[model samples]
Target chain A: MSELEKAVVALIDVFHQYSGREGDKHKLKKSELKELINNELSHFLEEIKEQEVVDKVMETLDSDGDGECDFQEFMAFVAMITTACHEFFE
Target chain B: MSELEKAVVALIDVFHQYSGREGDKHKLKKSELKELINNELSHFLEEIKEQEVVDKVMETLDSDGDGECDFQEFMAFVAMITTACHEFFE
Candidate 1:
């Protein structure tokens, strides 16, 4: 895989690493999503700071309102963050 | 930065590396877009092999019909591919 492709694969693995540890291996519960952002987005997220913040994060990402974040929702979250980071550097 | 954060950074760098080389430093012209997919997505794309295929790919991602792809469009493409890959492995 090219370096970029490897990065994309890393994202999948990161999602699964958290998403599979709990209910619905194909989805990420609030806790899993919390851990993911706190770990994977550390440089940008600045420690999150509060459970309520994490709650809000999950709430915003849960487009289907199923109380859990599916892969599509997770992808959307990543995409938005990446877009923000891009703008930050611009 | 966490490894996952690094991955996100790598994606941004990849876009700039290609997108900045020509017109619209922050947007990707069709040729740059073609190079990006053929280079970064080589493992998944299988060489692309034709201009028509690249054109179709761009058309599909160009939601604004601007003829050039901005970062949002690129992220959407990446997310779709990552989602597809995840499903393939499941």
Candidate 2:
């Protein structure tokens, strides 16, 4: 796979690593999402250390109102953060 | 950096690799976009062998109708494909 393709797979793998640890192997609960940000996005984002912060993050990502973040929601968050980083460098 | 952070960086790097070749340094022209998909997504996507294909892709991605794709648009495209892959694996 190209680097780009590998990157995509990494995103998928990372999501599964956290999401599969709890309920709904295909979705991320609040704690799972928090852990994902703390571990995977520690450089780009501040450590998600507070319950309130995790709640807010889940609220923003859970567009379907399912109380859990699906792959679509997770990808949207990734896109949002990537866009922020892109603009920072521009 | 974590693997996820590296993945995000790769996305940004790949965009600049093509977007900087000509025209706006922060956006991808039609040919540049074509090259990016053909080279970076050869396994996930088919080769762009026709002007019509490029035109269709640019038309879909140029949401602001600027005739080019900015990082935001590119990230959206990535999220779309990533979501598709996630579904395929489920």
Candidate 3:
């Protein structure tokens, strides 16, 4: 597969790794999102320690206000972070 | 170092691989976007042969009306497609 395709798969895979750990196998609850970010994105982003931070993140990502993040919301979060960190490309 | 980190890097790397080919090294012109989709996403999306299709895609992606797609715009496009194809996870 192409690198881009591989990357897309990786995104899906990593999300499931976390989302499947709790309620709603296809969506990430706040606690699941915390673990996902702490484990999967610690190097790229700060590790989450405070509950408020996770709450704020979930609030921003959960546009539909379902209280859990679906794949679409997670993908939007990824896009936002990647765009914010575009300096990494430079 | 993490899989998610690697995926983020891949997104950035792939964007530059196409965006740096011609004008405006930091942005993708219509031709560059076409080449990106044809070469990097042919497996995930349909191949583009018509100019009108490319124009429509650019119009949708270029939210800032810049006539070219920056990394932010490109990331948004990726999020959209990845979300649309969330069934890939199942």
Q: Which model scores highest in TM-score?
A: 2
Off by over 4 Å in 3: A88-90, B88-90
Instruction: List the pairs of residues colliding in candidate 3.
Output: none
Q: What is the lDDT of residue B25 in candidate 1?
A: 93
Candidate 2 per-residue C-alpha lDDT over A14-44 given as tens digits, one digit per residue, 9 for 90 to 100: 9899999999998999999998998789889
**TM-score, structure 3 vs. true:** 0.90
* Distance from true location, Cα of A48 in model 3, Å: 1.9
In model 2, residue pairs whose N, Cα or C atoms come closer than 3 Å (at least 3 residues apart or on different chains), thus clashing, are none
Candidate 3 C-alpha lDDT tens digits along B21-70:
99999899999999999999988889999999999999999999999999
In order, candidate lDDTs are: 0.86, 0.91, 0.89
Model 2 segments more than 4 A misplaced = none
lDDT tens digits by residue: candidate 1, A1-90:
777888889889888899999999989998888888777787887677688988898899999999899889988988888888888975
**Taking the tens digit of each residue's C-alpha lDDT, what string does model 3 give over A1-90?**
788988888888899999999899999999999999999888777989999999998998999999999988889888877776677545
Residue A83, candidate 1: alpha-carbon lDDT:
80
**Candidate 1 Cα errors over 4 Å, as ranges:** none
